[PDB]
């Protein structure tokens, strides 16, 4: 097998808006949040981004 390492994945911080986190609000977050496509690779079709 070849190397199993990702190459197409946006940077979590530098590929998104620079916003100030609300730590107090994040404390009250113990539920499963969505992880939509376009957060894993940039090789995503137009329709698949929202999925």
């Amino acid at each position: 097998k070849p190397d199993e390492t990702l190459s197409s994945q946006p940077h979590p911080i530098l590929a998104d808006h620079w916003r100030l986190d609300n730590f107090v609000a994040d404390e009250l977050a113990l539920d499963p949040q969505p992880v939509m496509a376009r957060e894993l690779d940039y090789k995503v079709a137009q329709a698949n981004e929202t999925t």
Binding site: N22, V24, A25, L28
Partner: protein, 50 residues
């Protein structure tokens, strides 16, 4: 019922002037429930908890 104060100028006047000072510590079984807290305007205004 009427004891005159001969040595004093006024017989009907209250000659003495008393100052009392009492301090009491009394263990009691009363609950003495809690002390509430004030409300912060920032909360419920800027939605810190969302």
């Amino acid at each position: 019922a009427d004891l005159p104060q001969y040595p004093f100028a006024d017989q009907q006047a209250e000659v003495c002037t008393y100052v009392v000072q009492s301090t009491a510590v009394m263990p009691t079984p009363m609950i003495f429930g809690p002390s509430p807290v004030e409300q912060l305007a920032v909360i419920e205004t800027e939605d810190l908890f969302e």
